[PDB]
């Protein structure tokens, strides 16, 4: 499967001036566009080489739409402050994510659109793209209103139509990277914590996409105790990194095997000290 996903954050700045607004587009785990109210252009900007191939008409359009998104968030911060009956003194946040997934076939699989105020679910579009999930009674008002305005219809048209038509366009144009898996470069490290015990660490580096599984085995059986697993982390060059460690008795390092599953590996790897 593949996905195109837009992320939007607005943060009210009560002391002076309008809210901070940041938008990022992604194809799978590749950021490809950006907008930031504080930056100089006041334009949607490219962040992947494969999107620079689009002409000015595309950039004017995306810039128009992203500004319109910005205003809608500014406006919504007002609505929400009243609804939740908060003062004009506090800073508040609105977050929005929407996007479509295509499946193995490159045909529409899934659409989504979720909205949060101060880091809490407010409203979200349901699976069927026809109805809404209101988290509380403020959102209920929105749900009833948006249902009466057929907001869903316009959104469904986009998510199952345009969204997937452009995701395919991006995938073809950026096939050299977006359709290439970088398999993990893997290795192990030994960290003598005392005379009696040691820490084995299993490393996955320079892989893409972000999805990866690292698991430990003792004598061919899954072990979880005395392990640690860090959150997957960006390398900074478009790839990701992750590791998993296990504390082991000294001299017993060979019982333990690290197992690595990833899309760009034909068969799962195994490593051993």
């Amino acid at each position: 499967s593949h996905s195109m996903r837009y992320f939007f954050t607005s943060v009210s700045r009560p002391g002076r001036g309008e809210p901070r607004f940041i938008a990022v587009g992604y194809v799978d785990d590749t950021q490809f566009v950006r907008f930031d109210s504080d930056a100089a252009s006041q334009r949607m900007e490219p962040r992947a080489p494969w999107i620079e191939q689009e002409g000015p008409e595309y950039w004017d359009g995306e810039t128009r739409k992203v500004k319109a998104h910005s205003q809608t968030h500014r406006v919504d911060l007002g609505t929400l402050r009243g609804y939740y009956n908060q003062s004009e003194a506090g800073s508040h946040t609105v977050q929005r994510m929407y996007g479509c997934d295509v499946g193995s076939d490159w045909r529409f699989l899934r659409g989504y659109h979720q909205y949060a105020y101060d880091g809490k679910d407010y409203i979200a579009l349901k699976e069927d793209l026809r109805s809404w999930t209101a988290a509380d009674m403020a959102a209920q008002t929105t749900k009833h209103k948006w249902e009466a305005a057929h907001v869903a219809e316009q959104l469904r048209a986009y998510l199952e139509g345009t969204c997937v038509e452009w995701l395919r366009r991006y995938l073809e144009n950026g096939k050299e990277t977006l359709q290439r898996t970088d398999a993990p470069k893997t290795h192990m490290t030994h960290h003598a914590v005392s005379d009696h015990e040691a820490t084995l660490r299993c490393w996955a580096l320079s892989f893409y996409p972000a999805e990866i599984t690292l698991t430990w085995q003792r004598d061919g059986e899954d072990q979880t105790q005395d392990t640690e697993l860090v959150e997957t982390r960006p390398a900074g060059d478009g790839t990701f990194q992750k590791w998993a460690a296990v504390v082991v008795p000294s001299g017993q390092e060979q019982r333990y095997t690290c197992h690595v599953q990833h899309e760009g590996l034909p068969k799962p790897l195994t490593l051993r000290w």
Binding site: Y6, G25, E62, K65, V66, A68, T79, Y98, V151, Y158
Partner: peptide, 11 residues
Amino acid sequence: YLSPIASPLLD
């Protein structure tokens, strides 16, 4: 390619 419309909570 962004959604061409972004309807507010209140119009």
